Amino acid sequence: MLDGPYQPTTFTPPNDYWILINSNTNGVVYESTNNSDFWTAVVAIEPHVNPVDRQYTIFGESKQFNVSNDSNKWKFLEMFRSSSQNEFYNRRTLTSDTRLVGILKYGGRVWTFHGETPRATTDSSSTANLNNISITIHSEFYIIPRSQESKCNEYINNGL
Structure with a gap:
């Protein structure tokens, strides 16, 4: 079920697999x-960080x-735009x-997890293409088929 870990890379995955x-x-x-x-970048914020400006290359x-x-947990921010001449906005947050x-x-659609663990659920974002x-991943990753989403849901919420 859980294939990987795979090292950081750029590629465009098949449909029907959770990354x-x-x-x-x-x-x-x-x-x-x-x-x-469609442009989504996720940025990670460590626990206990007072409001601060930080630079990111995306x-x-x-x-x-x-x-x-303000949490004891990590916050993952989905930064989204629908056009190259828009700014990004914080569309979703995963507190994990x-x-x-x-x-x-x-x-x-593209589906991601958001909310707060251990109660994060999926959500969809539409696209015409x-x-x-494609995706560039900056960290180790696994592959889980849609068939086994309940397992991916367990991992997202309770860890490996």
Whole structure:
């Protein structure tokens, strides 16, 4: 079921597989785009961080985000834009003590986990071009087929 760990790389995964990323920095966890209507980058914020501006390179662009974390857990911020001439906004947050992040391509949508562990659930984001969405992963990752989502859900929420 759980294939991997696989080392950091760029590729475009098949549909119907969860990519489950074990984040190991407080920088950019992954960046994903089809260069048309879909850009998502996740940034990781360590526990107990007062509001502060931090610089991140995503999609070859230097960004400053105002960032905070009042929790005992890690916060993973989905930064999203739907066009190359928009700024990013914080579309989703995953508050986690597992440090695991999930991405799935399925049924015309991209699915990720958000909320707070151990009660994070999936959500979808629409796109007109799902097939050309690639991903750059900056950390070790695993592969779990959709068939076994309940397992991926367990991992996201309770760790490996």
